[PDB]
Amino acid sequence: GSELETAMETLINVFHAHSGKEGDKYKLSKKELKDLLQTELSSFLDVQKDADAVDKIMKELDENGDGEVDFQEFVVLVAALTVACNNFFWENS
Amino acid sequence: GSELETAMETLINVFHAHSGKEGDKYKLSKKELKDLLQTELSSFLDVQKDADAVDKIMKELDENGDGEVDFQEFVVLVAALTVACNNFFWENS
Ligand SMILES: [Ca+2]
Ligand SMILES: [Ca+2]
Ligand SMILES: [Ca+2]
Ligand SMILES: [Ca+2]
């Protein structure tokens, strides 16, 4: 099946849906990623309600203080945090 | 939309489709991950043709030499490698 493959194609499409909407299509930005999580992962990855949560999240990515992200840094950080949350409910049954 | 959200639900379902098929449903294994990539990401992440490629890939994950993976280690390693490949074709246009 393409279920797992479809997983890579989908995050890449929404990624180019908002990332290229700001014009900076060659680099991601702090506001661009804010839209992607609050759009489909708002309930899981809290972010829209805690705007401070997005400043902290980009800080690990923008460790360079570039206020911009290379998108690759983003996938590794949120990938581990959300995956851990699913096991959190399963751990207590 | 749930396109990005659907991305997390799909890799998690196939993950529990083969991971729980070996009985070791509490921990992933070297053969379990081999099936997930060769099943839907065979063409992108070469693996089935280069069985040596799977030994090397788990080595970074099983840096502990446990021949077993915590699944979380897996998502971060293959997440960055496949994402980079998509930009490889885009970089040369
Ligand atoms: Ca962008
Ligand atoms: Ca950055
Ligand atoms: Ca398993
Ligand atoms: Ca491991």
Swiss-Prot record, chains A, B:
Record: residues binding Ca(2+) 2: 62, 64, 66, 68, 73
Keyword Signal attached: no
S-nitrosocysteine, modified sites: 85
Record key words, sorted: Calcium, Cytoplasm, Metal-binding, Mitochondrion, Repeat, S-nitrosylation, Sarcoplasmic reticulum
Places the protein is found: Cytoplasm; Sarcoplasmic reticulum; Mitochondrion
Superkingdom to which the source organism belongs: Eukaryota
Binding locations of Ca(2+) 1: 27, 32
Post-translational modification note: Glutathionylated; glutathionylation increases affinity to calcium about 10-fold.
GO terms for biological process, alphabetical: negative regulation of transcription by RNA polymerase II; positive regulation of sprouting angiogenesis; regulation of heart contraction
Stored Gene3D superfamilies: EF-hand
Expression sites by tissue: Although predominant among the water-soluble brain proteins, S100 is also found in a variety of other tissues.
Classification via InterPro entries: EF-hand-dom_pair, EF_Hand_1_Ca_BS, EF_hand_dom, S100-A1, S100/CaBP7/8-like_CS, S100_Ca-bd_sub
Gene Ontology cellular-component terms listed: A band; cytoplasm; cytosol; Golgi apparatus; I band; M band; mitochondrion; nucleoplasm
Occurrences of domain EF-hand (ranges): 12-47, 49-84
Keyword Transmembrane set for record: no
One example GO MF annotation: calcium-dependent protein binding
Additional remarks: Able to bind zinc in vitro; the binding sites are different from the calcium binding sites. The physiological relevance of zinc binding is unclear. Physiological concentrations of potassium antagonize the binding of both divalent cations, especially affecting the high-affinity calcium-binding sites.
Subunit-structure text: Dimer of either two alpha chains, or two beta chains, or one alpha and one beta chain. Also forms heterodimers with S100P. Interacts with AGER. Interacts with CAPZA1. Interacts with FKBP4. Interacts with RYR1 and RYR2. Interacts with CACYBP in a calcium-dependent manner. Interacts with PPP5C (via TPR repeats); the interaction is calcium-dependent and modulates PPP5C activity. Interacts with ATP2A2 and PLN in a Ca(2+)-dependent manner. Interacts with mitochondrial F1-ATPase subunits ATP5F1A and ATP5F1B; these interactions increase F1-ATPase activity.
Function: Small calcium binding protein that plays important roles in several biological processes such as Ca(2+) homeostasis, chondrocyte biology and cardiomyocyte regulation. In response to an increase in intracellular Ca(2+) levels, binds calcium which triggers conformational changes. These changes allow interactions with specific target proteins and modulate their activity.
Protein name (record): Protein S100-A1
